[PDB]
């Protein structure tokens, strides 16, 4: 699949669910990062667009307590790149995953209603 960055001003930022719906309407989904190669592809896309250090929704959403975090596209959550100490469900309200678009490419769980950039796959 092809990844596409949506780096938006405040007017066009989206919640996790809004971002998921946008990517699905176009024929894809929010991006799943299933290995280091995908991660490095997205990092290069971030550098090519000058989007260094921006935050982006990924397809990470909590499933059942048993499943834990899942990918919206249904791929297995095998590879992980959570930031140290994450996911921490800070204040019990963090059920969606965002990418910190710096060289670490780390993930953090945050409130699903936060307005963010996002990355689609198509
Ligand atoms: C204070 O809350 C923020 O910082 C902590 C630690 O980084 C994260 O876990 C959390 O999701 C928020 O981004
Ligand atoms: Ca993937
Ligand atoms: Ca967190």
Numbering used by the authors: 640 to 761
The authors write:
The human mannose receptor expressed on macrophages and hepatic endothelial cells scavenges released lysosomal enzymes, glycopeptide fragments of collagen, and pathogenic microorganisms and thus reduces damage following tissue injury. The receptor binds mannose, fucose, or N-acetylglucosamine (GlcNAc) residues on these targets. C-type carbohydrate-recognition domain 4 (CRD4) of the receptor contains the site for Ca2+-dependent interaction with sugars. The mechanisms of binding to monosaccharides and oligosaccharide substructures present in many of these ligands were examined in multiple crystal structures of CRD4.
The binding of α-methyl mannose to CRD4 is revealed by four independent copies of this complex observed in three different crystal forms: two copies of the CRD in form αMeMan/1 and one copy of the CRD in αMeMan/2 and αMeMan/3. Each structure shows the same orientation of the bound sugar. Binding of mannose residues to CRD4 results primarily from interaction of the equatorial 3- and 4-OH groups with a conserved principal Ca2+ common to almost all sugar-binding C-type CRDs. As in other C-type CRDs, the main determinants of monosaccharide binding to CRD4 are a conserved principal Ca2+ and four of the five amino acid residues that surround it. In addition to the Ca2+ ligands, the side chain of Tyr729 makes van der Waals contacts with the bound sugar. The position of the aromatic ring of Tyr729 is established in part by interactions with the side chain of Gln730. In some of the crystal forms, the conformation of the side chain of Ile749 produces an additional contact with the bound sugar. For example, while there is a single conformation of the side chain of Ile749 in the αMeMan/3 crystals, there are multiple conformations in the αMeMan/1 crystals. In the αMeMan/1 crystals, the electron density map shows multiple conformations for Ser671 and Glu677. These side chains, as well as the Ca2+, have been modeled at 50% occupancy, with one of the partially occupied chain conformations binding to the Ca2+.
